[PDB]
Amino acid sequence: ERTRERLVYEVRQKCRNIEDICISCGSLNVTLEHPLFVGGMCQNCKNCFLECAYQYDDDGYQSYCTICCGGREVLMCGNNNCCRCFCVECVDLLVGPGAAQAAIKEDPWNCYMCGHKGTYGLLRRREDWPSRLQMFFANNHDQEFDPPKVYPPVPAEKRKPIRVLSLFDGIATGLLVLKDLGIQVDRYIASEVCEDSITVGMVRHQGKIMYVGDVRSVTQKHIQEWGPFDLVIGGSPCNDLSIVNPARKGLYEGTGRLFFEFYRLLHDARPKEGDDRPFFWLFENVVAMGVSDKRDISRFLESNPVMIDAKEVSAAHRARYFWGNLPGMNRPLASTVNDKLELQECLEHGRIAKFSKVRTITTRSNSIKQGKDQHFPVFMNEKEDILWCTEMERVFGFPVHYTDVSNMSRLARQRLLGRSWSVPVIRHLFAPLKEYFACV
Amino acid sequence: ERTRERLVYEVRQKCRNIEDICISCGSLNVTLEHPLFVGGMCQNCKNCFLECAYQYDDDGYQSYCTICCGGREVLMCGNNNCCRCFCVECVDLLVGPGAAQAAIKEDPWNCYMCGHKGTYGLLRRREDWPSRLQMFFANNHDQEFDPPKVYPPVPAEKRKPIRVLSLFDGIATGLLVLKDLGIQVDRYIASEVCEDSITVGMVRHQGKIMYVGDVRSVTQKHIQEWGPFDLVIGGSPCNDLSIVNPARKGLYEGTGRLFFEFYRLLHDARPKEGDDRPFFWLFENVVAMGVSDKRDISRFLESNPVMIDAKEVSAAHRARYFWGNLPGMNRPLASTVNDKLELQECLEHGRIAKFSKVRTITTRSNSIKQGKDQHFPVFMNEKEDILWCTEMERVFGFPVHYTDVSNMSRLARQRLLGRSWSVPVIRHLFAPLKEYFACV
Amino acid sequence: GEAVTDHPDRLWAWEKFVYLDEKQHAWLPLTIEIKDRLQLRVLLRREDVVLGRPMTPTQIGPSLLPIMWQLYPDGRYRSSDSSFWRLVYHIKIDGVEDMLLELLPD
Amino acid sequence: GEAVTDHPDRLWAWEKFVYLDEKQHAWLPLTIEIKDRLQLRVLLRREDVVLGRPMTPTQIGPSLLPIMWQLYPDGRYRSSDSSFWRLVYHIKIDGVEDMLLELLPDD
Amino acid sequence: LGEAVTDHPDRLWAWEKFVYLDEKQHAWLPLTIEIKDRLQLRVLLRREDVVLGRPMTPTQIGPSLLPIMWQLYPDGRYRSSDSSFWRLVYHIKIDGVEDMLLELLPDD
Amino acid sequence: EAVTDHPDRLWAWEKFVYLDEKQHAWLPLTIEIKDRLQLRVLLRREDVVLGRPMTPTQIGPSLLPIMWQLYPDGRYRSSDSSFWRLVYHIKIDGVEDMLLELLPDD
Numbered sequence A, B: 001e002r003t004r005e006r007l008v009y010e011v012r013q014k015c016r017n018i019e020d021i022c023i024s025c026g027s028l029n030v031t032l033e034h035p036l037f038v039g040g041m042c043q044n045c046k047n048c049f050l051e052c053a054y055q056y057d058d059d060g061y062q063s064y065c066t067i068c069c070g071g072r073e074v075l076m077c078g079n080n081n082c083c084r085c086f087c088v089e090c091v092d093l094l095v096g097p098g099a100a101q102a103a104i105k106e107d108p109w110n111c112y113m114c115g116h117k118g119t120y121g122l123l124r125r126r127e128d129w130p131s132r133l134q135m136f137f138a139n140n141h142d143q144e145f146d147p148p149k150v151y152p153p154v155p156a157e158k159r160k161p162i163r164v165l166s167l168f169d170g171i172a173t174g175l176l177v178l179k180d181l182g183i184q185v186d187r188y189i190a191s192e193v194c195e196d197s198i199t200v201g202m203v204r205h206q207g208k209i210m211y212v213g214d215v216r217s218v219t220q221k222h223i224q225e226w227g228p229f230d231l232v233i234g235g236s237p238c239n240d241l242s243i244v245n246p247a248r249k250g251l252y253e254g255t256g257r258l259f260f261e262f263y264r265l266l267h268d269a270r271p272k273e274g275d276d277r278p279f280f281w282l283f284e285n286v287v288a289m290g291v292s293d294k295r296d297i298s299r300f301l302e303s304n305p306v307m308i309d310a311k312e313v314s315a316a317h318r319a320r321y322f323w324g325n326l327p328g329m330n331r332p333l334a335s336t337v338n339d340k341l342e343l344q345e346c347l348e349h350g351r352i353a354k355f356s357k358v359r360t361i362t363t364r365s366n367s368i369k370q371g372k373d374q375h376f377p378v379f380m381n382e383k384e385d386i387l388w389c390t391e392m393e394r395v396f397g398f399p400v401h402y403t404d405v406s407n408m409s410r411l412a413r414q415r416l417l418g419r420s421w422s423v424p425v426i427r428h429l430f431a432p433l434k435e436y437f438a439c440v
Numbered sequence C: 001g002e003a004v005t006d007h008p009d010r011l012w013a014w015e016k017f018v019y020l021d022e023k024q025h026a027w028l029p030l031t032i033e034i035k036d037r038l039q040l041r042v043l044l045r046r047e048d049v050v051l052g053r054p055m056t057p058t059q060i061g062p063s064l065l066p067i068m069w070q071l072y073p074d075g076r077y078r079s080s081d082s083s084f085w086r087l088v089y090h091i092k093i094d095g096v097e098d099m100l101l102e103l104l105p106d
Numbered sequence D: 001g002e003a004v005t006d007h008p009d010r011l012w013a014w015e016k017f018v019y020l021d022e023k024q025h026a027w028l029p030l031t032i033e034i035k036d037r038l039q040l041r042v043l044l045r046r047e048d049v050v051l052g053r054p055m056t057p058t059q060i061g062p063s064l065l066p067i068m069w070q071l072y073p074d075g076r077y078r079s080s081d082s083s084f085w086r087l088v089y090h091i092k093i094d095g096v097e098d099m100l101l102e103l104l105p106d107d
Numbered sequence E: 001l002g003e004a005v006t007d008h009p010d011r012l013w014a015w016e017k018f019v020y021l022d023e024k025q026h027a028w029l030p031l032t033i034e035i036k037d038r039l040q041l042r043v044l045l046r047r048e049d050v051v052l053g054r055p056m057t058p059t060q061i062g063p064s065l066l067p068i069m070w071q072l073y074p075d076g077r078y079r080s081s082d083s084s085f086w087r088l089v090y091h092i093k094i095d096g097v098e099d100m101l102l103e104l105l106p107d108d
Numbered sequence F: 001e002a003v004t005d006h007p008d009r010l011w012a013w014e015k016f017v018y019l020d021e022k023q024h025a026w027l028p029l030t031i032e033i034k035d036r037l038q039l040r041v042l043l044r045r046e047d048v049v050l051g052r053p054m055t056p057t058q059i060g061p062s063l064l065p066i067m068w069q070l071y072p073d074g075r076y077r078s079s080d081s082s083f084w085r086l087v088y089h090i091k092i093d094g095v096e097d098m099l100l101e102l103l104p105d106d
Ligand SMILES: [Zn+2]
Pocket: A022, A024, A025, A026, A027, A041, A042, A043, A044, A045
């Protein structure tokens, strides 16, 4: 245990440079540079940082310390939209003795990521730390994978409609986006077991979606009978109860049995050797996951993920991994005049916001409440209030009044909207498809 | 009772004509002809028929016998959209001995108003009975008052915006209709004490409505400080707490102390002698009220009502009295292509109706359960279902999603829509105003 | 004497100097006392008279008394001219029932 | 009780419930008694009080009293509203002068 | 003879050719395969703790009779990535070595 | 009883069914793995009814090679050019058994 303190004492004595030790856990094996501060990072802590760099509590505040991704007793930043966390040990060892007491005393406290000053004892912040953090998620385990195929564009005359297959459909965001872009659709087969979502889709899309129920019953004969497909897309919100519990997973369980069915059905639906017709696919999962699961998924699909965050073209914090082979999905994410990048443009008439981006939401309305004191995120007549459903719909990019059907209680709408994908992100990925399939 | 039997027996013996006895109660003092059947009618029965010809209980079926407007035990008609009543005594005397028992046996049974035949023993149905029933509601008691003054058309050049004062406003249907027509509005002062409707108006009309709280606090000085008005419109719903409990309404009570406030404020706002600017007003009440109250209201306002039913231009049964002096409000009620006159045009995709008009919807939740056995008026996947709010909104003529504001429980939405006025009727009434005030 | 515990809810002007409450009983103003410009008192007594014809407010014509009273809460009667009146006493005398109303300043 | 032949020739309304005789002396009507629809009598009293600002007919407003009174032969008075009134009596007691006028039926 | 085993594995993902890792990253190996008839096939799995090498992609594992990914479907049956079904015959522990047997099922 | 009758050419008429140049069927019964690399397969001679022929596509992926051919020094060359070593070929109770083993590549 004394190793870390000894190393800190030695550096303060000017015997070693701070770029040659692993500040997080205090080991002399340095292999990487810390993406935020100035120092070294060891192999063991790289995996833990990848895992825990994007995990947040039910209250919206961070779960694990920033430096060591661990912690036992913690402080917390005060500035809203900067809900990061620091633990006692790091503050005392690195910044200086007793600084934690002063940080606790001051009200409101600004952590070291807000302050205009860039140095605090040994803790020194970098200049391009946002870009550094973004690039840090490009350290995949294997790289031998070759570039994907590039099917030559088909001339406009020979183009023909698209046939789709969706797994764990949700409320049919894919069909909505495909209609928005202007691409003809010939089939759209969906699997789903949620009654509210089924009703919403049935009412909204004029019975164009064919439902086939549970996914654990689809056979290869069904796949061969339902005709050739040209796009297979799957992923969350995993409506079918294939993963047992939202919380009992921990960090490891559920992903395997979610990915098994997608791999099986994709294997069944893929063109056989000798056929050169275009074929595309897509798979999605959260950032907070084990390293072994990510390695295995990348091995079996033979590709590496591309992390996309929705806060660049919307007003929410939502980060995910996207496996696929769509044309040129690695290009930079850019906004358009049609987006609403602030929470002040999503509220109704006569209401005032308190943040810039909505932090987090869960199944229960208590999630929308903010702070350990449970204060609400909106101001109205100098009295705090929670977001309405018509405001969440704008936040997520859906058309307004999209989910008003079938006399659902106003609590189920919140879940339906929270579990769904983000429209502006999916449009980004689907945009290139116009070069291969006809248009209205 | 024996008297009625004796005269019935005598008419059977061809000693008297059936047009020389009051079939309802048997008195020989005949003064009018029965609007529906062939026979005579006396004064007391005329008053009772005016009172009780439009009262329907919770299930939607008639409350009192068709003939004698009284009765102890009643049968029920079977054909939907003809929920009428016939008491045993009347059926047994006027149709024949034992007829009511025979009708009891049959299942289902069509009453004498549906039947293709026009005679059943003595009870014979008049062929022009719809028009006759419509005309029977123009036997206004006592005086016939003078014609109202016609205000000369103002040339288009001098027209100026309108200034409105509303009492017991509701969800601001008047402003909605005035916007629809295309007439400029300068003021719209509203009095109201219900929070939900206040929120709906505030959100929907962008803070154009000035709220001034309850009505029992308004003084004459306020009516002067708030400037001259050019339209004073009042009536139900009784949002304020001057009634509160229908337990003390009966047929004569509860409705006598809203006219007090309306008359007081109208008297305060009326232009003084010598000021010949245009001035208008309008007052509304239900059909089922006491005769003395109607006489008094007509005396004090010095006009007779005009009964207008929304079933001619919409898909609901709603009959009201309208006092006022607007130009030409007695002209015939016509429809337009923009209306939806049947319940099959108001349902969402994939649903099938069971009637042609919504029997009776009021604040009470069970009012949607129309028909005997408390039917649910919609078929979906061969199952019974109730109307959604997005279907009631179309039924009442409102724009879709009008009342979707502020996380209201759907029961509150149902009540709000039930209490409100009907848009097409109000548009009919307000249409002539375009000749007097500017237009957008 | 004999105090009366309940009061009429309304007084509608049927004819000149005749008023009918909510139960169609006729009360007549027998005497009016005039202390000063802002003080007026009216004595109402209950008599069972043969009513004639009803009249419109135009035919009743100008009069010191209002055309309609209403029992506001707290036992105060508000007239159609927006003023306020106060109930002094309400008694019974061998079947004769009497009421008194006194104006209040604005 | 003194029987008084003093007889005001013309009474003009300076303010509501305030009347001035040709001698500018104020008369105050105190009470109105109603026995029949055509039997309305009003008691007038002579007083010496400070007169206020004059009131126009509009300010006076509707009132059961007429605005003008004028003497008529046979101990009668002609009112502004064309009605005729009778002088029931006029007496003086304890330095207080009381006069009672009653309405006559129309014909 | 052998002691029965009750804690069944949940997965068997191909790590190398002829090495399979369950949900706890323990290595099982197929030691013998029995061929009764054209539609009846049996595989014997045994657990050996060995030093593992670099992992292989499916395109490098190459064609093989065995599937690439088993999984424990409810009610105690193992589905493969080819949509077939397998049945657990026995699961026993002998002298510290644990053995598993899987039997294919006809096509219906 | 050792038998020196080594088959010359074995062709796959159906999956798990191989026909020698004498049209006699041989059925591979078991496949055994040593450690992690070496592969051994047992072939047995039998007289059974042959079914409809199966193309290479119908056979599908299989650890067995599709063709076998005799090679000097008691070796067989498989379809993928790999070499297999004979272990023994004996006859017991009128039933002939042959065991083949995969040699390491070099
Ligand atoms: Zn470390």
